[PDB]
Amino acid sequence: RLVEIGRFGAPYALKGGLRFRGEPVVLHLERVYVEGHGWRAIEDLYRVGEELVVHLAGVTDRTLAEALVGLRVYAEVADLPPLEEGRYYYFALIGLPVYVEGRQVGEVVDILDAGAQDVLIIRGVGERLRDRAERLVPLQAPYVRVEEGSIHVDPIPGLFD
């Protein structure tokens, strides 16, 4: 499974270096899959100002670099560095069913980084809830539980209201 980790910005210098816009998870990868181009080994990577520059095998001059500008960058899920117990990749949570007292009430459609905490955006499922507004829930709230393949919430009054 491929997951989007970033997107290439404009070329940097004249050796094929490419500004990388995305998650710093790219610092621990040996290769990335480039949209429309396939796997490429990461020859080098470094920082310039507030940006990160990537050097892929084959991309050795500005011209070859421009061809990749604007293209999305993907990583094999298995290549992502493992997380400590209690932490999860956004893609692993998005799409999961949400339960309240053993019953499905929704589906995670997105997660908002509120800086201190992460906020799950849940979409109702089923004719009755499918057309309500999105419901938000702090992931780190004590009344929220993450299980393999699902999320559970013990709704306090007003949470889903």
Partner: protein
């Protein structure tokens, strides 16, 4: 530094009952006080109320600091990792 009376009143009311209920507020300026620790406050960001589970660390900060707009879409957002639970 100030706490929206309305919001504080609601919080005090809840603490006296021992209840935990989502509290909605449009006051992003109000400062977080210890009485709010353990509560879930939904702060308005202009379009939605972003829920915040108040922790000790948040005491002293402004509620707005935890309710950003969902305006920016970040590249590779799905590769982000959640803050440890």
């Amino acid at each position: 530094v100030f706490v929206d009376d309305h919001l504080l009143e609601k919080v005090l009311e809840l603490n006296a009952k021992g209840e935990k209920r989502l509290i909605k507020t449009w006051s992003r300026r109000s400062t977080i006080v210890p009485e709010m620790v353990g509560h879930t406050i939904a702060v308005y960001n202009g379009k939605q109320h972003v829920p915040v589970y108040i922790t000790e660390n948040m005491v002293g900060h402004k509620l707005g600091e935890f309710a950003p707009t969902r305006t920016y879409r970040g590249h590779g957002k799905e590769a982000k990792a959640t803050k440890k639970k």
